[PDB]
Design a protein around this ligand. Structure first.
Ligand SMILES: O=C(Nc1cccc(C(F)(F)F)c1)c1ccccc1NCc1ccncc1
Length: 274
């Protein structure tokens, strides 16, 4: 059940602004929420709202997401729920903390000319890339502990906040990030998200490059994946990091590492890079 006293926010205390994403359900927009932090301050927030012409299935989907977000709770590497507009008088709105710097893929592409493996300014290092990977693994380990499956784990869903802090989100087909059991059997598990994490590692260590470059996405691509074909090492990877991708891309879901194993593994690589 939904706790109104804890999550209900007044529509009049919200000032909608610049759009961030657009889907068939509605849109993600940037807004200013006045006194959302049990105070009288102004906070910039991200709002997911339904269009005027909305399906009952669309309303159920946004309500489910609100319930999933209430269930998740707070974690530093997961977008935090601040409120909701569920009461009649306007459209259904889901309010989360805003991430100013956008998605990691777009950010890393803008920093290709600003990369050095290590410092002996506004530059990325190997430590940064391992840190982002580590933070995503931590947030995914938390989602697994709350018995949640992401369904769309990709760099476009990894947002960057202040102090190099990355947060897992969901703006919502994405065959490049999909595990073989998800394509061929439609099985969605936490182990199929491990496969997606491997693709996300490739995105991080290629500095925002698109997975499977120049490869046609169809039936042949799918048959090659099932046959054991894998992506070659990206341009900015370490040998250990590429092996971690290959472990995530194991054909058998049970033979892939868990997010808890990846947290420990990436945590040690961060130490070893120093
Ligand atoms: O991400 C949202 N919901 C969500 C749903 C399911 C799972 C998870 C997860 F990933 F956290 F488990 C998160 C979300 C909700 C409301 C508005 C924007 C949203 N995202 C885009 C955004 C853009 C800029 N700044 C912050 C966020």
């Amino acid at each position: 059940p939904y706790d109104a006293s804890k999550w209900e926010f007044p529509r009049d205390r919200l000032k909608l602004g610049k759009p961030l994403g657009r889907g068939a359900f509605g849109q993600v927009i940037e807004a200013d929420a006045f006194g959302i932090d049990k105070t009288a301050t102004c906070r910039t927030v991200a709002v997911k709202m339904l269009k005027e012409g909305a399906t009952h299935s669309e309303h159920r989907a946004l309500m489910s997401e609100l319930k999933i977000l209430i269930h998740i709770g707070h974690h530093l590497n997961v977008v935090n729920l601040l409120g909701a507009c569920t009461k009649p008088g306007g459209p259904l709105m889901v309010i989360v903390e805003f991430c100013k710097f956008g998605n990691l893929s777009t950010y890393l592409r803008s920093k290709r000319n600003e990369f050095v493996p290590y410092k002996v300014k506004d530059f990325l290092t190997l430590e940064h890339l391992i840190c982002y990977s580590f933070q995503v693994a931590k947030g995914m380990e938390f989602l697994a502990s709350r018995k949640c499956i992401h369904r769309d784990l990709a760099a476009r869903n990894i947002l960057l906040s202040e102090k190099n802090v990355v947060k897992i989100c969901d703006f919502g087909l994405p065959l490049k990030w999909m595990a073989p059991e998800t394509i061929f059997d439609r099985v969605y598990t936490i182990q199929s998200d491990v496969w997606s994490f491997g693709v996300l590692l490739w995105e991080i260590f290629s500095l925002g490059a698109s997975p499977y470059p120049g490869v046609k996405i169809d039936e042949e691509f799918c048959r090659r994946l099932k046959e054991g074909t894998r992506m070659r090492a990206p341009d900015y990877t370490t040998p250990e990091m590429y092996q971690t991708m290959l472990d995530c891309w194991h054909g058998e879901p049970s033979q892939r590492p868990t997010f808890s194993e990846l947290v420990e593994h990436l945590g040690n690589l961060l130490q070893a890079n120093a």
